[PDB]
Ligand binder design. Structure first.
Ligand SMILES: *[C@@H]1O[C@H](CO)[C@@H](O)[C@H](O)[C@H]1NC(C)=O
Ligand SMILES: *[C@@H]1O[C@H](CO)[C@@H](O)[C@H](O)[C@H]1NC(C)=O
Ligand SMILES: *[C@@H]1O[C@H](CO)[C@@H](O)[C@H](O)[C@H]1NC(C)=O
Lengths: 242, 49, 98
């Protein structure tokens, strides 16, 4: 329902037994977690009052896990799973460590930000590649049921969320690296005056600056499922927390 | 009296590019030169050159 | 032509030279201003950090990404002279303070 192109029609059903969970921890900005640095400014011995988009102290988090193996449900692409991007979001991602032949692999869920998700408009896509993120703001053609296949142990699905014969028009495209042995990651995504700002952090510390994109439009929505036939709580106990 | 000032010239401009380089010289200086019958074509888009 | 995003970086990279001692204008990362520059050895800049601000909100230092050198920006002179004039004198006495 997100896109307007039919990628595949192999196994589509209506699984009505998926309810998001609520965490038990609260936001604590006393030590510095939850705040972010300025874009490209440095301050030395300064107590500064900053007016910006920050999470509320004492709130609660909610998970948006869409773990699937073979069958994809249509309710997973419908609200409340597809929330509204009003002012901004602060996300906390858990770094899953898979061990195959005595080596570490890191794979976590991705998020795509758009307005109408049509090829006539722009959309921002991030994606981890064995420890390398790729942020691309392009005119991608989203499908009705996007997904992602874990390239760590093996699966049965084919990752296909964009269909383009040639390279579309992009406004920003950049790759970044992080610590593959990290435990948790933090992200900030907000917008103001038609300018989108994103911040990432791989360790426990105030978030650092990534980029600032000038779009001119107003974004109102912002998580595709991760099709993986490897992580399951029977032999390899790993859970996806976002 | 009126404060006297000057008019500075020769301004400086700095900005970080948003797109990577096209890297056309790397492909133009390839060790493999195709025959005139092949005439391989390479397309570049969304890059700075 | 005159569309898309594949542009050229020849006009904006004509000189790319930073002077030290003269008063000039600067458009650094969207921040526009005018002043003088001075060379200094700074090691508090990080990978993503390129400017330096103070408590008041003004820019005091920066770092060039093309040569990895830090600079400090100082405001340029803008003063006023004092003229002491008599009743029917021909030329007053000038005083430049400080
Ligand atoms: C980012 O990495 C992907 C593969 O991981 C590659 O296809 C792409 O060209 C890279 N982008 C840049 C700007 O290096
Ligand atoms: C990654 O994190 C581990 C543990 O915190 C640390 O030992 C290692 O030096 C880090 N590597 C990098 C490149 O930050
Ligand atoms: C500046 O430092 C960066 C990172 O250390 C390096 O990649 C770049 O080549 C350096 N540039 C110069 C001109 O030394």
């Amino acid at each position: 329902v997100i896109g307007d192109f039919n990628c595949t029609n192999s196994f589509i059903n209506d699984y009505n037994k998926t309810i998001p969970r609520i965490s038990e921890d609260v936001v604590d900005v006393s030590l510095g977690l939850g705040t972010y640095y300025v874009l490209n400014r440095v301050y030395l011995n300064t107590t500064l009052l900053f007016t910006g988009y920050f999470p509320k102290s004492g709130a609660n988090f909610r998970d948006l896990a869409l773990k699937g193996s073979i069958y994809l449900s249509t309710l997973w692409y419908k609200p409340p799973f597809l929330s509204d991007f009003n002012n901004g979001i602060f996300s906390k991602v858990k770094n899953t460590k898979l061990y195959v032949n005595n080596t570490l692999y890191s794979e976590f869920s991705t998020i795509v930000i758009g307005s109408v998700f049509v090829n006539t408009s722009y959309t921002i896509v991030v994606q981890p590649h064995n420890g390398i993120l790729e942020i691309t703001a392009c005119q991608y053609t989203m499908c009705e049921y996007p997904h992602t296949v874990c390239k760590s142990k093996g699966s049965i699905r084919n990752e296909s969320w964009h269909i383009d014969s040639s390279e579309p028009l992009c406004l920003f495209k950049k790759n970044f690296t992080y610590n593959v042995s990290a435990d948790w990651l933090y992200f900030h995504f907000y917008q103001e005056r038609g300018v989108f700002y994103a911040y990432y952090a791989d360790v426990g510390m105030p978030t650092t600056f990534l980029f600032s994109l000038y779009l001119g439009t107003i974004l109102s929505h912002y998580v595709m499922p991760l099709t993986c036939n490897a992580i399951s709580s029977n032999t390899d106990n790993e859970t996806l927390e976002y | 009296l009126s404060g006297f000032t000057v008019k500075p010239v020769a301004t400086v401009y700095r900005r970080i590019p948003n797109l990577p380089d096209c890297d056309i010289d790397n492909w133009l200086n390839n060790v493999s030169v195709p025959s005139p019958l092949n005439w391989e074509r390479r397309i570049f888009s969304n890059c700075n050159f | 032509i005159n569309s898309g995003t594949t542009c050229s970086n020849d006009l904006l990279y004509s000189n790319t030279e930073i002077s030290t001692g003269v008063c000039v204008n600067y458009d650094l990362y969207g921040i526009t201003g005018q002043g003088i520059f001075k060379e200094v050895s700074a090691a508090y800049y990080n990978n993503w950090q390129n400017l330096l601000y103070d408590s008041n909100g003004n820019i005091i230092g920066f770092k060039d990404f093309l040569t990895n050198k830090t600079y400090t920006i100082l405001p340029c002179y803008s003063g006023r002279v004092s003229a002491a004039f008599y009743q029917n004198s021909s030329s007053p006495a000038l005083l430049y303070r400080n």
